[PDB]
């Protein structure tokens, strides 16, 4: 997720949106010459705190690129304890870390300049500072979670798949996702279980069909009543009539079987 | 009021926008897990209940219904056609000789049908001989 | 004031952990317990799911199938004569089969042959064609 | 002459009483004939029923024989569509069965056992023995014409072959035109033989009852007329008996010459 | 001199009683037989008038002759049935089919008279048998005959049934043969030797030759095809005698054309010998468009024979309706009713009284004879 | 189930943060209205509280200054000095103490030396501002003193110790917003969890009317009913619950089906192909007599049908006519 942060951040840079292909590799190049040539609009305000040597950079314009190379270790003394190990890392892909360190100072200067201007309006501000905030925002904030409840149905529509796995997969979803795959496979059966509440309507239909077929058997079942007792005695001679089919062909062939049955003995 | 609104606008990114970025990798799982598991936990318990149900379900559906569904759907068929050609024909044993002689004939009627076609050849021969007469 | 030295919050992060504490540590430490509680309600919920499947079906199927039992009994009423034939189940079993077997082999025969006349006719004709070879004897 | 008229009177006493007294008995006769009239008509009751009986007796020769036949003849067109399925089924009991098993496969056996000796043993010896005589004959065509050698290349062949070429063409070409002609005679030839023979069994006996045709009804017709003459015979004995009564009156002819 | 008229009268009234007998010659013979014997016995003629009824009783003892009579009476007609052919077969065949326009009127007057005239001529063997019974029959025979008229009409049956074989067996011969040949003539003995199966034996001996020449007959044109192959085989035959054929090989300057010179025998030899089998079918091919009609005509003639048979049976029904009129002839006694009306009309009462005095006057003359 | 615990759990969620609100949110308001209106009340207030309140009512401020003891060590003199100057701290040295404390607190005199100059005049209303001043660092003691003094560091020297170095004093206010963002960051996930389980609560109200009401039925009456809704079904249903009797139930079905399959099942395998004879049902009814002879005619002898009918009527009529006249 932090990898895309590099692409977006100088996308907003109107003159550094295109160099994004090389920007993570030439950001120090941007900090070398573009730091004044192209970074004179936004980061120049942050460069105001770096004016002393930038003012000194006016005196050493002949070797400013040489001198900014001397300043590279002063970028290192900025991270002489926090980022000596990540220094190798931040150059290529962990550039977000030094952007996590770039935003580390970005929020301070805003806080810093806010502190300076608030130091003039503090004639009564502190009388209204430590007290008012605790009752206004906090009271709404507990109720504002309900506001997030509504919108957490709108914006996570494309994020619900995005954010289901990341953390729980190591502890909870490790077996749940496999269970999740198994459940969706069995989800079709459980869908019919919703229809199982309505299953009585076709379940009762089965016994109705034979009853409906019994209704059709009216005047047939009543004959089937006769078809048992009257006719059961007649199947016993019918097994003798079962030979008639073979005997039926033998009828016309009775005279000529004497010259035909010897063929079977030959084979 | 513009300064008031922009001053208020820097507070949500600590609170509102951060969770759409940070908790979008750290907090959104609550919406995701609960709803599906709400359905998942119910159905998974039903599976064992369905495992409890199948022994009766294999009884009512197959052993009771599908067993008897097969039985019922043919007692009408046998009483309509099956009983006609052997059970009724016992009373018609005088006809069963002729009634059973007919199926023998339909396997042999075209054998005797040579006589009628052996007469039409005279008409066919005259039609065929017409070309020779013209020539 | 530490925002200006927020680079030093790397060491003060341990001290900055107390800023987590009074508002966010109580938040997750208790919500971790909530994970047990939402398990506990699931334990109560899971117990209900087994019971309702037992109780409802055992009663929902109860009244309905009793009504359907009569039709099955009425279906046995449709077999009332054969129910009297149940005592003679050895003998009455053959008769209705004989009513079928003399017709339940022609039905596959009639249906199959007309659909398979293109191919099955030759196989069937093999047995019959041998006895038509008698034409040699009638002149000889 | 003393006693010439004395003896007869004694015997004539009761004798002469009934001489003309029978004229009174004129009334007695018609009772007797009317007595016979009842006798005659009652015996006619023996013949009264018999006239219908004899007609009925010949009516036995009406339906049982003659019209059990024509019923099949009459009902031929009424159900000819099903007649091709019902009557033939009974008709094809043996005649079609015999054709299917015997007549259909009668000729196949002798095709291969008789054709070869009758088609490949006719012109071989003549063809075999003709090569030598042709060698002797060709010498004459040359030695008796020798001067033709310079003109003997090709056209000298046609001097004797011309009359054979075109005629051979006609006799060989007719093989093609007779390809579909004779292939049908065999099947039709045998079927006509059995059909003619089977139905000639009908004819030969039917040509005998024509001698007996003059016997079925001729004798029976006279039987009815054998008893019509009996009625004709009744009117014979009626004139004579009634002739006695009118002539009974004429006895008054000379009697009127007395008073 | 009229005393002699009365004198001769006594005789003549004795002779007048000798004339009353000659009123009826059927009574003249009977009266004079007893008249001469005795005059009171001459009155037995009145009783002899009752003897005719007693004479019918004598016919009962004559029934022994009656049964022996009807038998030879049928022998009288049965032998002459040869002559009965033209008179009755024509009579039966044309009663309804020809005379229906006038059959009801012509039959009992004209048509029956001719048969009686034929009965006069050919059944003359029997007119005498009833002409002798024209006077002595009704007094004697009619009692026993009418008593035995059903006996003589049923005892007559079991010779007609033997000669009704023409029609009775016809249906049997027509019907009971086709069903019989299906299961009885199906198992006919090999080589039949009877007239009924003689035509079948004609097929058998004709089958004895046709089967032998079956394929060749269907391939008479193909006979020369194998002969044509024999012409191709002649090349091998020519090569067989190559040791003699070297003489022609020497004439290289002459070898060019002699090959086709031999072509005459290469073509004519097989051609002439192939004219036999072709002639066997050419004679029928040129008229095949007409001979096939003859072949089917035999089957039609069977139906034509069927037409002749159903003509008679239908024509047989025609005479039975006319035979109903023959029964109506037995009901047609209305024609002879006027001949009996004159019998009843002449039964008057009034001349009976007139003769009473007449015989009273006439019989009185007998007592005066004593003079 | 368990909202009351969850609400009790929810109360515990608010309990941690709002425990401070008991003293930093609930206490300040009453003294907040007692501070702006302090000057109306400090009159009578400064006659009994400076002795009683310091020892009892305003000794509680020493409890919060305790964690700040290091810096408060100099401030500790203030409760020490006030105790020894009770008659003099009621209205007088409430402004003088800042000057006295300034001399001992030069690093913090930056506020105090500036405080001593302006506090003397409006002291009876200015003392309120001074009170905030020693409260301006209390929670800031957790953050302000050590961290802001850690400015001279190589990572923050050029950037901060050159341009932001002038913000050594104003940076105090920067702390107050950080906790606010911290709570919101503490609420980055807290609200999300609070968003739905609070929402889910009203789905646990549904399982009251739907689920838990039913389990209350399950507990007593349905459990006894289970004794009832299965005793009857053993005839048809309850036998199979153990598989040994499930076949026996099928055997009873087999007892019931002993006649059915004996008769019905024989035609089961052949009825599927018996549909062909069903096609023969119509054919054998009306097409039987037509197809008997036309099997060869309708196939290939179609042209040969007309001559047979022609001889059937044109020439055969006369013979049958004689019979027909008899049949008429």
From Swiss-Prot, chain A:
Where does the record place it?
Answer: Cytoplasm, Cytoskeleton, Spindle; Cytoplasm, Cytoskeleton, Phragmoplast
Single Gene Ontology BP annotation = cell division
Q: What terms describe the molecular function in GO for this protein?
A: microtubule minus-end binding
**Which residues does UniProt call coiled coil?**
169-197
Cellular component annotations (GO), alphabetically ordered: phragmoplast; spindle microtubule
Q: Which UniProt keywords apply?
A: Cell cycle, Cell division, Coiled coil, Cytoplasm, Cytoskeleton, Microtubule, Mitosis
What S-S linkages are listed for this chain? Answer: none
* Residue ranges of the TM segments: none
Q: How does it assemble?
A: Part of the augmin complex composed of 8 subunits. The complex acts on microtubules and interacts with gamma-tubulin in spindles and the phragmoplast.
User: What is the recorded function of this protein according to its Swiss-Prot or TrEMBL entry?
Assistant: Contributes to the assembly of the acentrosomal spindle and phragmoplast microtubule arrays as part of the augmin complex. Regulates the association of gamma-tubulin with the spindle and phragmoplast microtubules.
Q: What is this protein called?
A: AUGMIN subunit 7
What phylogenetic lineage does the species belong to? Eukaryota, Viridiplantae, Streptophyta, Embryophyta, Tracheophyta
Curated annotation (Swiss-Prot), chain D:
Q: What phenotype has been reported when the gene encoding this protein is knocked out?
A: Lethal when homozygous.
Q: Which domain of life is it from?
A: Eukaryota
Localization of this protein: Cytoplasm, Cytoskeleton, Spindle; Cytoplasm, Cytoskeleton, Phragmoplast
Q: Which ranges form a coiled coil? A: 150-170
Its family remark reads:
Belongs to the HAUS3 family.
What job does this protein perform? Involved in microtubules reorganization during spindle and phragmoplast development. Required for gamma-tubulin localization during mitosis.
The UniProt subunit note reads as follows:
Part of the augmin complex composed of 8 subunits. The complex acts on microtubules and interacts with gamma-tubulin in spindles and the phragmoplast. Interacts with AUG1.
Listed name of the protein: AUGMIN subunit 3
Identify the taxonomic lineage of the organism of origin: Eukaryota, Viridiplantae, Streptophyta, Embryophyta, Tracheophyta
Tell which residues of the whole protein are contained here.
165 to 423 of 617
UniProtKB/Swiss-Prot annotation, chain E:
Function of the molecule: Involved in microtubules reorganization during spindle and phragmoplast development.
Question: Per the database entry, which stretches of residues form a coiled coil?
Answer: 263-302
Positions spanned in the full protein? 181 to 570 of 796
Subcellular location as annotated: Cytoplasm, Cytoskeleton, Spindle; Cytoplasm, Cytoskeleton, Phragmoplast
Q: Subunit comment for this entry?
A: Part of the augmin complex composed of 8 subunits. The complex acts on microtubules and interacts with gamma-tubulin in spindles and the phragmoplast.
GO cellular component labels: HAUS complex; phragmoplast; spindle microtubule
Name used for this protein in its record: AUGMIN subunit 5
Q: Which domain of life is it from?
A: Eukaryota
Null mutant phenotype: Lethal when homozygous.
Task: Report the source organism.
Answer: Arabidopsis thaliana (Mouse-ear cress)
**Range of residues in the leader sequence:** none
Taxonomic lineage from the root: Eukaryota, Viridiplantae, Streptophyta, Embryophyta, Tracheophyta
Q: What is its main location?
A: cytoplasm
- Could you give a GO molecular-function term held by this entry? microtubule minus-end binding
One example of a Gene Ontology biological process annotation = cell division
Q: Which family does it belong to?
A: Belongs to the HAUS5 family.
UniProt entry keywords in alphabetical sequence = Cell cycle, Cell division, Coiled coil, Cytoplasm, Cytoskeleton, Microtubule, Mitosis
Swiss-Prot record, chain F:
Instruction: Write out the annotated subcellular location.
Output: Cytoplasm, Cytoskeleton, Spindle; Cytoplasm, Cytoskeleton, Phragmoplast
Return the annotated region ranges for Disordered: 313-328
List the residue ranges forming a coiled coil, or say none: 213-239
Regions of biased composition (Basic and acidic residues) lie at: 315-328
Summarize the protein's role.
Answer: Contributes to the assembly of the acentrosomal spindle and phragmoplast microtubule arrays as part of the augmin complex.
Q: Subunit details for this protein? A: Part of the augmin complex composed of 8 subunits. The complex acts on microtubules and interacts with gamma-tubulin in spindles and the phragmoplast.
Please give the family membership noted in the entry.
Answer: Belongs to the HAUS6 family.
Q: What is this protein called?
A: AUGMIN subunit 6
Question: What is the native source organism of this protein?
Answer: Arabidopsis thaliana (Mouse-ear cress)
What range of the intact protein is shown?
1 to 328 of 741
